[PDB]
Amino acid sequence: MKVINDPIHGHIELHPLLVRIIDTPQFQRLRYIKQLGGGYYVFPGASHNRFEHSLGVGYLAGCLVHALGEKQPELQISERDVLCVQIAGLCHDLGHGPFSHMFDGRFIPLARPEVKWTHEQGSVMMFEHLINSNGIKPVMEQYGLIPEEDICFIKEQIVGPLWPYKGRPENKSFLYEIVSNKRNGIDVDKWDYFARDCHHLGIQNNFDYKRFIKFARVCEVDNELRICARDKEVGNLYDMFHTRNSLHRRAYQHKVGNIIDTMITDAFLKADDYIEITGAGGKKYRISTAIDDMEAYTKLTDNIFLEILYSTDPKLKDAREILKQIEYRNLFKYVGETQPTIKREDYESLPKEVASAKVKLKAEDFIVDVINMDHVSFYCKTAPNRAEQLIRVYCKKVDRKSLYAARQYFVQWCADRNFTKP
Amino acid sequence: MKVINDPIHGHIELHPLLVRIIDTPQFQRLRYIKQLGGGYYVFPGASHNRFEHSLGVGYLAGCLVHALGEKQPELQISERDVLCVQIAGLCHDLGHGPFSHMFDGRFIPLARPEVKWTHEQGSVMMFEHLINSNGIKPVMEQYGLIPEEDICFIKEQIVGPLWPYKGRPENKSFLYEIVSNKRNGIDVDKWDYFARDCHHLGIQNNFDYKRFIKFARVCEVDNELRICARDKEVGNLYDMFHTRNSLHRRAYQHKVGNIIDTMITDAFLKADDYIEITGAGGKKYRISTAIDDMEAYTKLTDNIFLEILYSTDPKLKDAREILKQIEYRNLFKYVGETQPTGQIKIKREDYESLPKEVASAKPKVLLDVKLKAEDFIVDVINMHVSFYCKTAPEQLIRVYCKKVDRKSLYAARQYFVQWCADRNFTKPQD
Amino acid sequence: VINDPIHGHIELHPLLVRIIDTPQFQRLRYIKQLGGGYYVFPGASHNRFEHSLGVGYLAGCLVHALGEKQPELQISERDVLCVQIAGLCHDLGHGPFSHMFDGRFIPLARPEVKWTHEQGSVMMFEHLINSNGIKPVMEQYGLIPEEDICFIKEQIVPYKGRPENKSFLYEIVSNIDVDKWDYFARDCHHLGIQNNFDYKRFIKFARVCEVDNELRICARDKEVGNLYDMFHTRNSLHRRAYQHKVGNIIDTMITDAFLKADDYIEITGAGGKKYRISTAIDDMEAYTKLTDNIFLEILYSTDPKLKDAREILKQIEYRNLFKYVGETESLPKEVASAKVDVINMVSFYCKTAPNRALIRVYKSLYAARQYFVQWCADRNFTKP
Amino acid sequence: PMKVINDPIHGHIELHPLLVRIIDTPQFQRLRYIKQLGGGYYVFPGASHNRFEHSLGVGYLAGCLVHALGEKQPELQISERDVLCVQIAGLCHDLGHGPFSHMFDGRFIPLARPEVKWTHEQGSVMMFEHLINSNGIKPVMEQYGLIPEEDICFIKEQIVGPLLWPYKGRPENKSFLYEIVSNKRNGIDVDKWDYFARDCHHLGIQNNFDYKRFIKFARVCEVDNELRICARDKEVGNLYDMFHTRNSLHRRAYQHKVGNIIDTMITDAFLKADYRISTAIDDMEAYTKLTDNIFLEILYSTDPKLKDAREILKQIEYRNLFKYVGETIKREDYESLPKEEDFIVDVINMVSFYCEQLIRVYCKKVDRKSLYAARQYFVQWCADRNFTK
């Protein structure tokens, strides 16, 4: 039983099987992916990576499952189930690319509009490669799990359905709500990064998971088992959504923060053809091509930022000069924001529309970013166990002649595309 | 006035001059060099880099002088003096290599023993290079500074004396103790990384800089102006040293942490001859040679770790596998610890020869496994306050082994105990 | 200097000290801020006294900071003292258990007369200065009694104390307020609620601004996030503490218990005149005596005229409170005939371009809940 | 179904239904109207807090300490029954406190009735007895698995002490239970932990001590020829940190020049109006009503007999305190001390591992100062009585 020292969670004990998963080139790969991505460049405190977050989600998953189990033994929660929810919360973020969310959502739609790709899909594909290349299946059976059935349970917790779920039957439905919960917006993953980003950004985090877990119970609602909260402890939830909202409004949706994200994205596109990443069978993959092979994708981390920056190859000159501008602080200028009163595939066309909306501006000077941002069941003391899209535009030309021009092309772009007035 | 959101200090206002220095390839380079270096692989919380630390030291530098300036006008503390102290604390750590203290503390001595290199010497070379290549010197005189004298003052605050100090006179001696304090070990640098390492490592910190600065005053001692603290705020000083002790015993001196430090160093030595970094005048530099040229050194960060790890060249075969062992946790094994008490300390030049010495230390009773120098890692770890009144104002030596078998390690342990015995260090504790 | 858990060290200029050391001001030490809320949240013992000290302090913190940042604002030495005294005496008129009194009790006993804690604050302030001789002390430290005393009253209740050019001054105590900042920060401290807002910094980045041809107080655009966390603190504090189901119930029990005692309890005021509980708001000599003592006076009373009043407080201590039916003066008669608590509740500048821009009702309880439900439909309210 | 209370110090306190039954009583609710620091409030505005919210903490902390030993060491034989006695003991620990707490049993009664040997601890037993008797808690006790005859004595012993192995409530193998609420040897108990953490919070003082950690790594041991409670050798730094706070609160808050002046001011006015106030400690039915209310009943009174008491209380509100003369004994004798000429003279009074009395004098008249008259008498009194110079 290994223990790791955490600033947020204190002491995290790791069952030897988890450790076997952690000590792998596929999981250690997460030491090199900044959580907030571009956000480190606006908030100097936020250097932290996905690796230390993963241990957080794994810890919390174990905290929620074990705690529900002792509170409600009739849930028939086995020791085998506990590792499965842990291992799932642990490998949830295996698929994240360079700078986390910048990759799946901003870059790939631009580099390869054709492909439907998410980081959740990557986490599943990576998880298999982790198991296959390190031979974890026998170790799983060594600690009392059944690999054929449990690996399916784990993959479903991460990506979702491949009664929908094949890993566990409907009586243990609540288990799916622990690591990734889409309906409620309550999962041990958020509790980690909600608490974890606040620790680093310098914001007070009001939500207390230790108390929520204290008063959490599995209950019947609409003929389905879901995880529910106490009625007296509803105040703890309201601070979560505000903490959830503060973190979005301030950090994730920061004017400068997502701007640096697009500059980096912009350089990657400029570097995609020329930079090669070695994969399976010695096949060379480009930056956009890497997500196909997990052997190659294992190599793709935040390293890619610095190799362009440090590159001497003239083939990488245009991409490098964009990254140089980040370090000298000569950024893209902000034009305006709007709302759809859009799909990722269609991101491709968005700059082409603004240049031709009617000093001359072309598409090459236009960057357009798309940002994407009760339902809680409750039990009672007397009767327990009873129940946007924001669109911004930036410009590559900084001078005050080209920038005014950019705004009106933008304003008409909004008018004909029937959005709100900027 | 730019404001930066810092988790430790809340708000660091940055004077326009300071900002011009930051937005440079030479300073921004500090974003890709982890503060604790190897410690990240033992503490997941300690991800933080030199950059966010530097800004703190700069901020604290400013907080200290302004407070002395406001409290004691006879001191002649100018707005010019404040900026220079700020610039010093800000650029204090420019010369740090990959993974900080591993580079100039373990690596460079192994790669180039003859060469005398410190990171303090590095920050001075870098600071000059920042200004020349970014034309910051004209920016200074515009905001009321004197390039001739102040650049000397700043460099002296950092490295020290090249009355020894030529940048400023003796009546303002107290300024040299703010960023770099050799006597007691109390400076704005200690305070930042004390607070920041605790924040990330998860250690309880009692020391309050905000209060210590509040009750700080300049005083006459030994016919010399020094920084002093209140007699009432004596307990608070003790809280700093309780923290200072925790950070060392727990974090900086972690058994595995310095092992992973030695492992990285080892891969570097094996990759040194083969890895090329382009510098000034199109001159190609190796990893150990880079410290000479600042143009090349600008590019040298924690990236070099990933460049070796992700490399496909067969020349880097041995170098990549040392890094591979880290990812699999097939680490070097700890043999034992000892101290050179009484006897003269080890010097940096001789670090090279130390594994050769232990391998050739005759273990009393013969054993079935004979070890050569290449299986031995030997690491060397290395580690005055005035008061006023209200009415009247070590060296640690460890050995590790690359071969892990339980029969293979015992031979090593017996070699080590012998090495301490013949060299009169202390007997290792079981 | 005073030691505060929230504001740390509060420097007190002797004029302030003279105002504080009075039977009229030191009186507010006996008025629980949350009132009935103490019986639900055990930490909230705190009173209006230490709150007042907070508001005066914050008030002083705001103007002087504007004065140094913008000397051009024409910040007089009087302005610093007046706003302090204004923020200091802002809550003088509060009755026993604070808002329970002004919000529920006076409206029930004497529905006709409009008396609020704000209106009360001036009458007490008037009784205070005149009866303890503060007027000579004010002019002694550079004040003008005729003009300055009115200015304070104005902040408490364009304006004759100060002209339209010193308009920025009026937005400070009563508006975003130095007042709001105290009880938002103060209540979080005692209740155990996260207070995200930082006033010291709002004060750091606060500025005088011309907008719509008016000098008003503004905030920095980058420090907009600081504003959002406050309204959250503002919203959280209401949802949890101020609008608490049991909390407002216990206030109503006390309100009713005070009524059974209204006719019978007498307090001596000006001229040895006997005033009842509801009548005290009229005479300021008598009002100084009406504090939270009145609660225990019913509890400890041996008098049988107050037997019914006492039996309610007894019912409170044994914890047999009223039962909640549903949510959606004349009102109780209204529900009874169908075949009750009533609760009621920005400029920015830029760095590059500064100086620019509910009704609730309380197995006989099951029947009542059904009786109530018709009343909502009856007056065209919402379905519970 | 365990009712939870929101506490600022401890966060949330779980209450076993019995504890709740004890709390909802005229005798326990009495603690809502007794200021903790007493005189400290007129010197520290933050210190509004009363004995009530303190009692719940001690009750909460008490439960935290015993259970931790039981789960850590099942062979110690801590029953779920044993735990409740300690919770109830910690909960009712402060039942006997009078108006403004320690001012009452240790600065007033010695003056009012020097003859009588009275402590608030002795009072809490009397209050605890009448509470149960007058609220019918005894059947509820048997309802949750307690045995009233043996347990009421055990609790009473936890509070006051023994009423050779003296204690009749529990045997010698369960010695550790007696150190939890009341610790006579060390001064380390859950009582200290609450008001240490609680007073700092209201006073605005920094606290280094962590009870959550001390409770976590604490264990019961066979040393000192006794089963006693201990801490780890490494957690000496944590223990030392409690001691910086204990002295801080004493040096700063409890032993304040002005704070102790206002205590005697209140005390003198109390003597001045004096079942009566001094006699009340005899009857618990009457004592139940005796709270901080008495301060206000003196202050707002119109009766001419209490006029001087009011004029002294008037003196409080206008901030004309006694003038402090100087700093430099048994309870019966506090009375003779000023006589030894309206002089007030106050007397202030204040470990296992595994692998003072100060006297101050004030004067009622500031003017005719000649405060030196008080000072000249004092220097002679100490010299004459061979105290410190």
Ligand SMILES: Nc1nc2c(ncn2[C@@H]2O[C@H](COP(=O)(O)OP(=O)(O)OP(=O)(O)O)[C@@H](O)[C@H]2O)c(=O)[nH]1
């Ligand atoms: N220049 C610079 N800014 C940094 C750095 N790290 C974080 N920042 C933040 O990033 C922002 C810099 O982007 P800019 O758009 O140029 O800042 P600005 O133009 O002054 O605009 P404001 O946000 O209103 O201050 C600043 O607000 C800083 O707080 C850094 O290393 N250099």
Ligand SMILES: Nc1nc2c(ncn2[C@@H]2O[C@H](COP(=O)(O)OP(=O)(O)OP(=O)(O)O)[C@@H](O)[C@H]2O)c(=O)[nH]1
């Ligand atoms: N295994 C592992 N430990 C980590 C990691 N990151 C930080 N740690 C911590 O760093 C320490 C590394 O020591 P290890 O050698 O891996 O574990 P150990 O118990 O000290 O020694 P062994 O388990 O016998 O190898 C552990 O105690 C962990 O708490 C990681 O990624 N993998």
Ligand SMILES: Nc1nc2c(ncn2[C@@H]2O[C@H](COP(=O)(O)OP(=O)(O)OP(=O)(O)O)[C@@H](O)[C@H]2O)c(=O)[nH]1
């Ligand atoms: N004057 C006054 N002080 C208060 C009040 N409430 C709390 N205090 C605190 O009580 C202390 C006042 O001490 P005082 O005795 O009134 O003044 P002093 O100058 O120290 O002593 P004297 O001049 O002898 O009265 C200060 O530390 C205040 O922080 C109050 O309502 N009025």
Ligand SMILES: Nc1nc2c(ncn2[C@@H]2O[C@H](COP(=O)(O)OP(=O)(O)OP(=O)(O)O)[C@@H](O)[C@H]2O)c(=O)[nH]1
């Ligand atoms: N009985 C009681 N409740 C208190 C006390 N102090 C705070 N409280 C809170 O006030 C509420 C009392 O109202 P009740 O009618 O007893 O509420 P309840 O339905 O019985 O219990 P809950 O469901 O936990 O709210 C409790 O929920 C406690 O959280 C106290 O001293 N006695």
Ligand SMILES: [Fe+3]
């Ligand atoms: Fe995640």
Ligand SMILES: [Fe+3]
């Ligand atoms: Fe440093």
Ligand SMILES: [Fe+3]
């Ligand atoms: Fe107010």
Ligand SMILES: [Fe+3]
């Ligand atoms: Fe106590």
